[PDB]
Design a protein around this ligand. Structure first.
Ligand SMILES: CO[C@@H]1O[C@H](COS(=O)(=O)O)[C@@H](O)[C@H](O[C@@H]2O[C@H](CO)[C@H](O)[C@H](O)[C@H]2O)[C@H]1NC(C)=O
Ligand SMILES: CO[C@@H]1O[C@H](COS(=O)(=O)O)[C@@H](O)[C@H](O[C@@H]2O[C@H](CO)[C@H](O)[C@H](O)[C@H]2O)[C@H]1NC(C)=O
Lengths: 131, 131
């Protein structure tokens, strides 16, 4: 899927991503960080993948190494609909805001100066990105 | 500037880009093609740069080699302002359209199946990209 680099997204600046969730979607991924080996956020809604169903999986990747996975109890995505996610960070957490009012936090484990890299993958057709 | 890859923009599909032209803008660049060495369009408004004044320069790049520059009289860009373009291509031309109705056309020299790559450079900050 789409890969964007040189984002230079600073603490407090908002990255917005709107896409279409495939009607038979199994999974999609938004990766954010410095590059493919250094992700401050791996955001992975799983509809029906890796033994999971309707679960948001989050993790980090630091110098190629996956961190400790975290999951949310809520799943505000529907196959066959448009979804928007808005991401920002401070030194402590990433804050991910989702459609139906939902907002959660994921610990900032890498302390990058900026989010420079985003990559999308899976069953999510990106329609627009706002920086 | 922002670099985006795995665009899979087909003929007819519209790439919409909105960005901020720096207040002291000397020139800016939007590159489109397969990758950084294979550009079906290098779109380069020069406010005052390389000996040009308020002239758009367009070119292609094929296997790392610049083609022949096309230039225009019409120059609807202003420093320190927001610029919106809509880009598309077909068999014949690339087209760059501005909201007010200006259309720039540049011949399609590479004849690629899709635009997969976009890059901004110079005094232009991309704020929003849509497909
Ligand atoms: C060691 O197996 C790993 O288990 C994780 C826990 O979930 S479970 O369903 O297996 O019990 C899996 O999520 C994990 O899958 C990987 O998870 C990372 C993010 O943590 C990312 O989504 C990868 O794409 C995904 O494969 C699984 N195996 C690994 C580490 O690949
Ligand atoms: C062959 O040198 C090139 O001269 C062009 C002007 O020629 S002139 O006869 O009108 O004076 C310059 O446009 C050109 O600048 C380069 O142009 C490409 C697109 O064709 C791109 O914009 C580069 O960023 C720009 O440097 C110049 N070539 C150079 C400087 O190598």
């Amino acid at each position: 899927g789409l890969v964007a680099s040189n984002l230079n997204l600073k603490p407090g600046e908002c990255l917005r991503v709107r896409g279409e969730v495939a009607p038979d979607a199994k999974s999609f991924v938004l990766n954010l960080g410095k590059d493919s080996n250094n992700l401050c956020l791996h955001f992975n809604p799983r509809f029906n993948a890796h033994g999971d169903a309707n679960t948001i999986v989050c993790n980090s990747k630091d110098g190629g190494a996956w961190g400790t996975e975290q999951r949310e109890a809520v799943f505000p995505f529907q196959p066959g609909s448009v979804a928007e996610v808005c991401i920002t960070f401070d030194q402590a957490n990433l804050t991910v805001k989702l459609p139906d009012g939902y907002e959660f936090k994921f610990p900032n484990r890498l302390n990058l100066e900026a989010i420079n890299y985003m990559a999308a993958d899976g069953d999510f057709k990106i329609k627009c990105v706002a920086f």
